[PDB]
Amino acid sequence: SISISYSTTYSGWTVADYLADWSAYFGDVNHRPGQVVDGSNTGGFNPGPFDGSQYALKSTASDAAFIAGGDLHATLFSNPSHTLWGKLDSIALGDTLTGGASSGGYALDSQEVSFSNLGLDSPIAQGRDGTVHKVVYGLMSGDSSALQGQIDALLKAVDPSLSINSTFDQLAAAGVAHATPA
Numbered sequence: 001s002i003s004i005s006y007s008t009t010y011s012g013w014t015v016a017d018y019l020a021d022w023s024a025y026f027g028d029v030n031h032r033p034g035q036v037v038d039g040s041n042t043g044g045f046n047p048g049p050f051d052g053s054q055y056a057l058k059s060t061a062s063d064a065a066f067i068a069g070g071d072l073h074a075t076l077f078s079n080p081s082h083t084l085w086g087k088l089d090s091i092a093l094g095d096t097l098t099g100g101a102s103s104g105g106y107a108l109d110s111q112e113v114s115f116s117n118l119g120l121d122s123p124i125a126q127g128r129d130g131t132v133h134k135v136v137y138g139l140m141s142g143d144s145s146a147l148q149g150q151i152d153a154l155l156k157a158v159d160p161s162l163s164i165n166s167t168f169d170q171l172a173a174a175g176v177a178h179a180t181p182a
């Protein structure tokens with residue numbers, strides 16, 4: 001089932017409130033036609049250049065950053081263009097991104113929260129409608145709505161009383177979350 005890791009700082013927050021705040025602060029990197037600037041708002045893959053086990057992106061305006069983990073593929077100019085697809089197992093949120101292809105991976109110097117065992121798989125044919133794409137492109141664009149909806153479904157699948165409106169501590173009591181040090 002979904003497995004959540006959270007710094008004790010966030011023990012009393014709901015998942016929805018945490019994500020709404022995190023993404024609003026991360027802010028839209030404007031990865032859109034006319035506005036993509038390589039090395040600024042593309043993020044990167046490990047091993048890359050356009051596929052790998054991690055995709056990571058920091059904000060254009062601060063150190064906030066996320067890492068998507070799984071078996072990921074960006075089509076870039078190939079049909080269906082500008083689709084991220086594959087298998088998405090995890091999302092880690094925090095700040096101070098480090099690493100990259102030259103390091104053999106990415107890590108956050110301050111990981112706040114992670115969501116693992118997401119079990120998302122999106123075929124290339126779904127294009128930009130796939131859940132993997134929506135989750136990650138949403139985060140790139142400062143919008144955690146898609147991620148929230150996937151977490152909500154995973155939580156309900158454990159028990160319908162659990163949701164994105166549960167606190168991290170409630171989710172820990174319910175067996176789906178664990179705390180890390182503040």
Ligand code: HEM
Binds near residue numbers: 034036038042132
């Ligand atoms: C190495 C990382 C990436 C590079 C170098 C890259 C590069 C680009 C470029 C060059 C464009 C076209 C800009 C233009 O039309 O002027 C673009 C657009 C786009 N990319 Fe990426 N991208 C990357 C990662 C991603 C990821 C991970 C996603 C999805 C989660 C994504 C989704 C899109 C979308 C949706 C568009 C806009 C398409 C449209 O509205 O027509 N990209 N990207």
